[PDB]
Amino acid sequence: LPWVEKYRPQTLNDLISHQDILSTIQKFINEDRLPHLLLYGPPGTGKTSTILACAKQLYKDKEFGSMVLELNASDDRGIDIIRGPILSFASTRTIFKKGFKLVILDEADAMTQDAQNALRRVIEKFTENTRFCLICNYLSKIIPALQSRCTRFRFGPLTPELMVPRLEHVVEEEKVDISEDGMKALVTLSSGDMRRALNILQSTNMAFGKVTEETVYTCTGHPLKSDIANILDWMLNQDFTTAYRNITELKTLKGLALHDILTEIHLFVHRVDFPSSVRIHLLTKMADIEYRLSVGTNEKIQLSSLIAAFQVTRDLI
Amino acid sequence: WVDKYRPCSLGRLDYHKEQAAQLRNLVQCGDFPHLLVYGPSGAGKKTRIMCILRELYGVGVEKLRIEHQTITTPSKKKIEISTIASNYHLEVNPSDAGNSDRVVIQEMLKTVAQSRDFKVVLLTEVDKLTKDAQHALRRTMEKYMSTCRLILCCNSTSKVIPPIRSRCLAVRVPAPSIEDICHVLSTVCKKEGLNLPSQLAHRLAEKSCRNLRKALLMCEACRVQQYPFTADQEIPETDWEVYLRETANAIVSQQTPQRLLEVRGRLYELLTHCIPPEIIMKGLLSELLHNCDGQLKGEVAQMAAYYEHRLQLGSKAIYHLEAFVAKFMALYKKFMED
Amino acid sequence: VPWVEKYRPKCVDEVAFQEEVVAVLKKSLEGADLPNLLFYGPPGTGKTSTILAAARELFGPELFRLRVLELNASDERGIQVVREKVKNFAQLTVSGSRSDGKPCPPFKIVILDEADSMTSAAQAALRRTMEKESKTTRFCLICNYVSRIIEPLTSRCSKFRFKPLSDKIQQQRLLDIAKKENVKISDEGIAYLVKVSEGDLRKAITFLQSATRLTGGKEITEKVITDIAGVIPAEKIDGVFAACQSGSFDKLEAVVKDLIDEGHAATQLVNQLHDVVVENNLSDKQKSIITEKLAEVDKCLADGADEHLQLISLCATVMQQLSQ
Amino acid sequence: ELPWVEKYRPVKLNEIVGNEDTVSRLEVFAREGNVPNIIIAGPPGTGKTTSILCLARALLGPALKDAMLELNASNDRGIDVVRNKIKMFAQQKVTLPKGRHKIIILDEADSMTDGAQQALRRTMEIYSKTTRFALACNASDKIIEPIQSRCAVLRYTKLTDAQILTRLMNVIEKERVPYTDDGLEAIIFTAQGDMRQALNNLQSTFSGFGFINSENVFKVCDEPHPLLVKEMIQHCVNANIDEAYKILAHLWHLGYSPEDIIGNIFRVCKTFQMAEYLKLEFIKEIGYTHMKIAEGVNSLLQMAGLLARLCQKTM
Amino acid sequence: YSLVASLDNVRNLSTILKAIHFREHATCFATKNGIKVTVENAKCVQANAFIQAGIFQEFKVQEESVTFRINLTVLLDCLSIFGSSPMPGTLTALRMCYQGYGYPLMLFLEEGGVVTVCKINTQEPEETLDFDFCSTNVINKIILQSEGLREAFSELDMTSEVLQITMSPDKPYFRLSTFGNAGSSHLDYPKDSDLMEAFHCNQTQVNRYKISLLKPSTKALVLSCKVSIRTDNRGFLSLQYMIRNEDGQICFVEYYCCPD
Amino acid sequence: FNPVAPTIMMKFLNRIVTIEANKNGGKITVPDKTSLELLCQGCSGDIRSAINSLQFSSSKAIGGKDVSLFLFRALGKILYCKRASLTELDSPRLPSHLSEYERDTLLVEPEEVVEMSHMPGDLFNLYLHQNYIDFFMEIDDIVRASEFLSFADILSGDWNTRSLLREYSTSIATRGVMHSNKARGYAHCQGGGSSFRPLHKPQWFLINKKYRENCLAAKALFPDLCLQTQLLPYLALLTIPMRNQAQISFIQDIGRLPLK
DNA sequence: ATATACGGGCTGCTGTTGACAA
DNA sequence: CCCGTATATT
Ligand SMILES: Nc1ncnc2c1ncn2[C@@H]1O[C@H](COP(=O)(O)OP(=O)(O)OP(O)(O)=S)[C@@H](O)[C@H]1O
Ligand SMILES: Nc1ncnc2c1ncn2[C@@H]1O[C@H](COP(=O)(O)OP(=O)(O)OP(O)(O)=S)[C@@H](O)[C@H]1O
Ligand SMILES: Nc1ncnc2c1ncn2[C@@H]1O[C@H](COP(=O)(O)OP(=O)(O)OP(O)(O)=S)[C@@H](O)[C@H]1O
Ligand SMILES: Nc1ncnc2c1ncn2[C@@H]1O[C@H](COP(=O)(O)OP(=O)(O)OP(O)(O)=S)[C@@H](O)[C@H]1O
Incomplete structure (x- = not known):
């Protein structure tokens, strides 16, 4: 489940996006020149x-537990529990006589300085076993001494174009009926994280039965693009009280948060033409608004202050 | 308090009787939610809580069984905490331990929860607590809202986080006006010989603010200094107020760095005698604002609010008090020469 | 229970x-x-x-x-x-x-x-x-x-x-509970109580229980709910703006001192002032400045600041704006 | 293999392509054979x-196994066992022909x-007639003053482009790899001083491409970060928020966490050519923004607000 | 109730467990033939025991095998709760029950009218290696006594870091070397002695081993009467012991270690 | 003792190099004189490193011993602000309206000075707060410096992130105190003053310790911080006797502050 | 007429991991 | 950092 x-x-060919890095890793495997990695x-x-x-491809199924x-x-990651076990692991003559050993170190940004220095010595001493x-x-929590001997590889955020086909395959695997707007809205509401595009689908499909833009937006609660455009139009032109009443009624009808509205308003503010200074004013006030919404204050007053900060500068100009 | 002329029954209360009847109606049937009492200091919340406990139970609340308890931190460190808790009701003040209040609350509350068919656990002064302890x-x-109820007491219900505030009722007790204070002072003194003329009682009530405790203490102190009262007899003041008055007088007569160092040393000595920074700031503001009469008055008020927020956000008081003093001195010097 | x-x-x-x-x-x-x-x-x-x-x-x-x-x-x-x-x-x-x-x-x-x-x-x-x-x-x-x-x-x-x-769901649930426990509710009292509760199920349930135990089982009107919740009267709150509009700093200080003497929480005062501000006959710039000041005061109070000085600051800013 | x-x-001492003075002096000392204790930084x-090991091997020769002691950080360096073993090795007598001594x-x-160093400083001034020391480190402020007070402190420097290019050409000639001038310039640019990093990058590029064209080098991954922030700070100097936000957006879309960017901003800002008032205000704003980010509220809007506040100062 | 087991001489199980006790946790294996407790460390050293069904008097198991992980220190303390020095004529009896998955292990002990009850909750399991040392690739094998090496392995705890074992048909038949702060220390053992029951080494073998992994063999050497040493082509070391009880039965303990 | 004077080391080094030169043996380049004072300049009165560096350099500067800066000297370096006469360069200038913030060139790096004193930042800031008043002549600069010190204080008030960001506070405090002194910072405007004045120590430590001990002496003895803030005003307005001996002294302690 | 030393101001205010003397 | 003073030496 x-x-x-x-x-x-379960294999290297069933991934997407990054292709040069995967080909380089495959070439490393083929020529048996695998270096220390810093992904x-x-x-x-x-x-x-x-x-x-890579580990499952390198070794057999009955050796994964002994090598x-x-x-x-x-x-536990201290010094003694690394100084003993891993030194003994490199003090182990290889069983099955094939290949070398691997030590996977996940969440490497949790060890302390002494452990990292000892690890530097361990990794440099014996690059054969x-x-x-x-x-x-x-990358700021890794000592530079250990940062100068491992091949650095960067895994950037994913992009929708190659992100679509895997979701299409997942949809086809089970019995799910999908649309066009549903796929676009599903992909858009994930900033490159694939796990936030596969869990939303499961949550939505098990609540309604079909997936569509309205369905996913109701399942999550994200405001629509047209909603943000209407809010901005109401901000830039109309009066104070009328805009306050309109957005208050809109938020009361469909319960909307304030973080997503701020993010979309930020993007639209940067997308429109402004004479420099007003943009600086809006960015400063909106950053203050966003910071102030993580202490335990009231949302209505924050919305009023956002309205007030957006209104006057554009109204005068 | 004086603790000698204090009532111990919901009846015969000198003020705030209607809310007393409401509380009696609530207590006469059980089935209680948690209670949170708030209001200005000197209004008498503790008397209301004690009388509610007396009404809920029998007369077995008038005993004193002061007890000590030693608990342990995770590693080895030991905390000694004293409770006035008598039979049935348990009373604790988890502020005597600075950063051991969290473990104090955890251990003591979880031990007493398993230990009418229910008890109560008072938690005096919930204002000065961290965030994890409240959680x-x-x-x-x-x-465990089936065998024990909680009656918290505090003032300025802003420090308590919303989840607790949205988990219990809220009972408020306001200050007992002015005429009621003079009446209670008159009756308490007339019970014990002599009397208070109306003018003297009114002056004492006006000068003693809203606190009946302070008014009673001042009246008793004046009673031991002079037996025959007059219409033009003043009230003794504390030594931490005249000191602040002198410091405020000296902070405006001259504006030089040496005077700044002198007032800084005065603040050091005042802080030495166990006066919190907040009272220092409030008294300094009152004395300084006694004569500004201009926009500088509003600017001073805003700067003082800024410095108060700074003090309650930082960890060194003298920095912020000195900064506020310097800014006021500069503003006054600029205004004087224009 | x-x-x-x-x-x-x-x-x-x-x-x-x-x-x-x-x-x-x-x-x-x-x-x-x-x-x-x-x-x-x-x-x-x-x-x-x-x-x-x-x-x-x-x-x-x-x-x-x-x-x-x-x-x-x-x-x-x-x-x-x-x-x-x-x-x-x-x-x-x-x-x-x-x-x-x-x-x-x-x-x-x-x-x-x-x-x-x-x-x-x-x-x-x-x-x-x-x-x-x-x-x-x-x-x-x-x-x-x-x-x-x-x-x-x-x-x-x-x-x-x-x-x-939402309003309708809370009203229906409260009516169900009241019918179950045999307490006589008024159609206007419930509409006022749901507004007071600001969207809280537990708070509304506790309010209902505290009202029905106080009254003893008789009709409960809006006046009981105002007393139990603690809403500041409008006549008192008009005085704050009346004093801040014109006069001097001493009257403003006296008004705020009396308000804090009566024991009202500053959060309720800020919430009620905000509603009055955005519905009066004031210019846009003054409203913007006052709203920003209210938000700043609310945050500073939420970060464990004092009560008297912040109210004085807000009232002084209002006095500056209303005399401009 | 490796x-x-x-x-x-x-394996020799003349293949090192680093500094020119200290290496020549060390070669002369190895020729003579009366080296004092040295500390390299x-x-x-x-x-x-590499220099230390080559010097020791040249000094001893065939008797290296039974006359040399090497200690590391993986090996336990407390006080008791280390002082015991050090005193065993110092007091033990061995025969060496003319002027060769024992090396620790x-x-x-x-x-x-501190205890280990304070126990060690006694053994390093008495047995000098039969043994000598040699220390390598990165941060020289950790070693206490008394230990430095009797050692020769040699301080290295980051390698320049010429020696890096010469040794890279030697490696390429050895391995017969077709090359191109701009690709090697790009590799040297990515190196930024350290040499093993440059060799690893070249090997990674050559792994599955067969060419060191610049496009292949950039495609197979990496890229240096700070020079982009250096231009961004200059842009915010002149109140150009519109041009300033573009680089921030590019870096954020590239996949960098807020803390990593904000640390580099401070590091580049300290060593810059501006006035004093602007530097003070910039440091203040960066400090406040870093506190906010560390508290948990990290997003694009906070960085945009920081840029707006930086641009507001100059108006 | 899955498995229930009763006995009247706790000392046999207690000494068998104490002969293998150097870690903190252990894994059990209950099968129609008996129990098997194994322990591993550093992913190289592994020690296992065996208690066949012949010893037990009341042994009951249900359906298939049963596996669970138990703390060894607590169990060994609970077993010998009546003093580890009984005079001849005093015995202690124990009963143990394990009622399937998710439930603790019972232990009722009795002696002379005193009855104790204890429970040990088990959180299982772990994974074990596959150290197969079947007698097919074994090249060097020897069998020998214990009183010869009592002092020898007692005279083996110094501040060294590596122990060298060399076995050859000629000259140093069985030599142990230890390099420490002071100097070398050789402990050559020849053939045709009172402790040389079979010498059948084929080709010379010199190997290095870690002191930290091989140290806990002293406990197995102390409570033993014979020791068998085996090493294969690669250089893995297998140690076989032979312990006896008061009644007169025999139990075995095996140690596996890997070379440097 | 005191570090060796330059002349003594100079004469002894000259004697040693003369002795080496007279040895002859071969044509070896005598070290140049111009580097010979350089060797003695970067050693700070220590013979042994000077001789070691002379031996190293005579093989054919070396010996850069780290400095400690003597914290009371670092304080004076920060508080005296050695300035230059604005040598003609291309440094950025404040364009139109910041004409009152123009300053002459500086020849000191505060970060290196603070790091080299080997002191925690929160202590350096306390010392600066204690000692920075006397060197100032105007009030507005004092106001600005106090605001900068307060802002430096704010950044370190938590516990989880107190050590992640600490350089910001010290850097801000140092640069604010240095730049705010506009009276001193005009190059050729330091004539004449700077008399023989000694520095001092912060007075906050004793006051804080007294506050804590008085906290405990108020709590445990009227335990049935708020007591010092609310109950202790009542104690200050108590002034009546009671049944003890060591408590009347405490009552007279707080309540007898000097006042005319 | 120029290089070198006295004089006066400093030890000080919640959690998780690691080394030393017994 | 800072100012003024007593001794060796050419
Ligand atoms: N590019 C991708 N290709 C294939 N599956 C992906 C991809 N990105 C995410 N997934 C899936 O999403 C799951 C969750 O992502 P993870 O790989 O666990 O995240 P991560 O890379 O480990 O980064 P962490 O754990 O948050 S530091 C994976 O197990 C995959 O099934
Ligand atoms: N109804 C009353 N009649 C007469 N005196 C009263 C009455 N209520 C309170 N007092 C007096 O008020 C004093 C006690 O004040 P309290 O109300 O108990 O202060 P408090 O409740 O302890 O407030 P905090 O939060 O603990 S500081 C004593 O002097 C009492 O005699
Ligand atoms: N969504 C709901 N539906 C029905 N009854 C509810 C609902 N929310 C609250 N209640 C009522 O209010 C009581 C309190 O609910 P809880 O589950 O304790 O609140 P909560 O989930 O803990 O949120 P907290 O405690 O404020 S973080 C419930 O026992 C119900 O009687
Ligand atoms: N001066 C140099 N000349 C040639 N190769 C060098 C030079 N410095 C470093 N290298 C290369 O660096 C590789 C490994 O570097 P090391 O010498 O081990 O680094 P290091 O001197 O030990 O400094 P650390 O350990 O990183 S602090 C060698 O294999 C060389 O190829």
Whole structure:
């Protein structure tokens, strides 16, 4: 169950987007020149999946438990529990006489400085019986000494064009009826994270039965593009009280949050023509508004203040 | 308080009788929600809570069983905390432990929850608590709402986070006006010889603000200084007020760095004698605003609010007090020469 | 037992609002493929109740010891407990069936509330825990603010926002409860009470109980609800603007001093002032400035500042604007 | 076998293409054989450890196994066992022909505690007639003053383009890899001083492409970050918010977390050519924004507001 | 109730468990033939035991095998709760019941009218390696006594880091070397002695081993009467012991270690 | 003791190099004189490193011992603001309206000075707050400096992120105190003053410790912070005797502050 | 007429991991 | 950092 981990890729050819990196990794595997990797990027891109597919391709099914170590954030990572076990692991003469060993180090940005220094020594000392692989999200929490010996690979955010066919395959696999606007709205409401495009589908399909733009927007609660355009039109032209009443009624009818409205208004403000200074004023006030909505205040007053900050500067000009 | 002429029954209350009848109607049937009492200090919330407990139970609330308890932090550290908790009702003040209040609340509340058919657990001064302690208290008071009820007491219901505020009723107690204070002072003194003329009682009530505790203390203090009262007899004041008055007088007579250092040392000495920074700021504002008469008055008020927010956000008081003093001095110097 | 604990939803067909989540839970009950859950929203909408009802009617009251654990904010959570205890529970195996022969789901449920009060170090272990063990355990996180949770924790859970309740639904539920408990309500009193409650089920239920126990079982009007809630009278609130419009600083200070003497919370005063401001005959610029000042004062009060000085600042800014 | 970063290691002392003075002096000292204790410092990726090991091998020769001691950070360096073993090795007598002495090397000595160093400083001034020391480190502020007070401190520097190009040409000639001038310039640009990084990048590019054209180098991944922020700060100097936001949007779409960007902004801002008032205000705004981001509220709007506040200062 | 087991001499099980106790956790294996407790460390060293059904008097199992993980220290403390020094004539009896998955392990002990009851909740399982050492690729094998190496392995705990084992048909038949702070220390053992029951080495083999992994063999060497050493082509070391009880039965303990 | 004077080290180094030169043996380049004072300049009165560097350099600057800056010297360096006469360069200027913020060129890096003193930032800021008043002549600059110090204080008030961002506070405080001094910062305007004045130590430590001990002495002894804020005003207006001996002294302690 | 040393101001105010002496 | 003073030496 739980589609996201039910349809996880099991081979290197069932991924998308990044193609040069995958071909380079395949060439590394073919010539048996696998270096130490430092895979980093934003959430939901396919790092652990890629490394696990590489591990399953390299080794047999009965050897994965005796020649592969896995250390994560839920395990213990100090000094002694690394100085003993991994030094002994590199002190192990290889069983099955084939290949080398692997130590997967997930969430590598959690260890301390001493552990990283010892790991630098471990990885540099003996590059014939172990091949470390670090996977991180922040590159500021890795010491430069350990950052200068592992091949850095960047996994950027995904793009809709190659993101569509995998969702189409998932839809076809089960019995789901899909539309055109539904796919576009489903893909758009995910900033490159594929896991936020596969879980929304499961949540929506199990509540209504069919997927459409209105269906997904009601399942999640995101405001529509036309709604944001109407709000902006009401802001830029009409009076104070009339705009307040209109947006109040619109928000009361369909319960809408304030974060998404702020994000869409920010994008539309940057997309329209303004004489510099007004844009600076709007950006500053809207950033303050967004910051102030994480303490426990009231949303109505924040909406009124957003209206007030947007109104006067454009009304005078 | 004086604790010698305080009532112990919902009847014969000198003020705020209607809400007392409402509380009696609520307590006479059980089936209680959690209670949160708020209002200005000196209004007498503790008397209401104690009388509610007396009405809910029998007469077994008039005993004192002061108890000590030692608990342990996660590693080894020990916390000693004293409770006045007598039979049935349990009373605790988890503010004597600075950052051990969270574990105090957890352990003590979870022990007493398993230990009418229900008890109460008072939590005095809920204002000065961290954020995690309130979370744990809220969860444990929601979980076991079948054998124990909570009656929190505080003032300025703004520090308590909304989830607790939206989890219990809210009872408010306002200050007891002015005429009622003079009447209660007159009756309490007439019970014990001599009397208070109406003018003297009115002057004491006006000068003692809204706090009946302070008014009673001032009246008793004046009674031990002079037995025959007159129509032109003043009231003694504390030594932390005249000091602030002198500091405010000196902060405006001259504006030089040496005077700034002198007033900084004065603030140091005043802070040494256990006066919180907030009262210092309030008194300084009152004395300074006593004579501004202009836009500088509003500017000073806004800057003082800014500095107060800064003080309650930061961790060093003297920095902010000195900054406010310097800004006021500069503004007054600029205004004087124009 | 108070009315809040007596009318707690014991079944999925007792939650009023939130159609999508209840539909998803119903579909996943008589079937399979239930994903991870992440509930968030304002207080008094019902999040613990829904998951507790789902767990109760999926397993049964006699099968709670070895199927569900709840880790609240009173459990001393840290890295060690997440590393050992949660892993040990999640690494077990599904037990047998129940007494009454019914279909059963082959998974356990781990419930943890106030996950926003934890630390990042524990959250990393927690997020890695529920990937390799997605065969026998499902996780239901509950929070008020999503921002206090790291990205990989919220990137693998279905996010469900709980809307604040509507007028008609709250009115119907309150009428049902009042009919059940035999209390005489007025058609205008309920319409005022729902407005006062600002969209809170628990607050409205407590208000109803406190009103019916005070009155003893007679008709309750709006005047009782105003006294119980504590709404500031409009005649007093007009004086603030009357003094701020013209005069001097001393009268403004005296008015605010009396208002804070009476014990009213500053949040209610700000909320009521905001309604008056945006409906009067004032220019747009003055309204904008006053609204921004009100928002700033509200935030500063929410960050544990003083009450007298902030009210003085707001009133002084209003005095400056109204005399311009 | 091994990758290209650990297989092409110099075995002699004249293959090192780093600094020119210290290496020549070390060659002269190895010729003579009366070296004092030395402490080497410098940026990573130069070859300090290579120089130390080559010097020791040249000094000893065939008796290296039974007359050399090497200690690391993976190996336990407490106080008790380390002081015991050090004193065993110092007091033990060995025969060396004319002027060769016993060598004790402690790599990355900055990780030692104060107790270890304070116990070590006694053994390094008495047995000097039969043994000598040699230390390599990165941060030289960690070593206490008394230990430095009797050592020769040699400080390295980041490699320039000429030596990097010469050794890269040597490697290419050895491996017979068809090349192009602009591609090698791009590789050197990506290197940014460190040399093992450059060799690893070249090997990664050559893995599955067969050419070192610039397009292939950029396609196979990487790219240097700071020079983009350097232009962005200059753009915000002149109140050009419209031109300033473009680079921020590009970086955000590239996949960089807010903290990584905001740290580099501060680091580039400190070493810049501006006035004092502007520097003060910029530092203040960056500090407030970093506090906000660390508290959890991170998004594009906060960075846009920071840019707007930076541009407001100059009006 | 899955498996229930009763016995009247706890000392046999207690000493068998103590002969293998150097970790904190252990994994059990209940089968129609008996129990088998195994432990692993550093993904290289692995020690296993065996308690056949002949020892037991009341043994009952249900359906298939049963696996669970138990803390070893707590179990060993609970077993020997009546003092580890009984005079001849005093015995302790124990009963244990495990009622399937998800329920703890019972232990009722009795001696001379004193009855104790204890429970151990189990959170299982882990995964074990596949150290197959079938006697097909074994090249060097030897069998020998214990009193010879009592002091020898007792004189083996120094501040060294590697132990060298060399076996050859000629000259150093069985030599152990330890390089430490002071100097070398050789402990050559010749053939045709009172502790040389069979010498059948074929080709010379010199190998290095870690002291940390091979140290806990002292406990197995102390409570033993014979030791068998086996090494294959690659260089993996297999140690076989032979322990006896008061009644006069025999139980075996095996150790597997990998070379450097 | 005191560091060796330049002349003594100069004469001894000259004697040593003369002795080496007289050894002859071969045509070896004597180290140049111009580098010989450079060797002694970057050693700070330490013979052993000077001799080591001379040996290293005579093989055919080296010996860059790190400096410690003597914190009381760093404070003076920050608070004295050695300025230049605005040598003709292409530094950016404030275009039109910021004409009152023009400053002369600076020859000090505050970050290096603060780092090299080896002190925590929150202590450096306290010392600066204690010692920065006396060097100022105007009030507006004092106001600006106080505001900058307060803003530096705000950034470190939490506990989880107190050590993630600490350089910002110290940098802001140092640069604000340095730039706000417009009276001093006009190059050739330092004549004449800067008499023989010693610095001091912050007085906040004793006051804070007294506050804490008085907190405890108020709590545990009237426990049935708020007591010092609310109950202790009542204590200040209590002034009546009671039944004890060590408590009358405490009552007379708080309530007898000097006042005419 | 020029290089070098005295004089006066500093030890100080919640959690998770690691080394030392017994 | 800062100012003024007592001794070795050419
Ligand atoms: N590019 C992709 N190709 C294929 N499947 C993908 C891709 N991106 C995400 N997925 C799927 O989404 C699931 C969740 O993403 P993960 O790989 O677990 O995230 P991640 O890369 O590990 O980053 P973290 O764990 O948040 S640091 C994966 O198990 C895949 O099934
Ligand atoms: N109805 C009353 N009649 C006479 N005196 C009263 C009455 N109510 C209170 N008092 C007096 O008020 C004083 C006690 O004040 P309280 O109301 O108990 O202050 P409080 O409730 O403790 O407020 P906090 O929050 O604890 S500071 C005593 O002097 C009482 O005698
Ligand atoms: N959506 C709802 N449907 C029906 N009754 C509700 C709903 N929300 C609240 N209630 C009523 O209010 C009571 C309190 O609900 P809870 O589940 O405790 O609130 P909650 O989910 O804990 O939200 P908190 O506690 O403010 S974070 C329930 O027992 C119901 O009687
Ligand atoms: N000066 C140099 N000349 C030639 N190759 C060099 C030089 N410096 C570094 N290298 C290369 O760097 C590779 C490994 O670098 P190391 O010498 O191990 O780094 P390091 O000197 O130990 O400094 P660390 O350990 O990173 S702080 C060698 O295989 C060389 O190819």
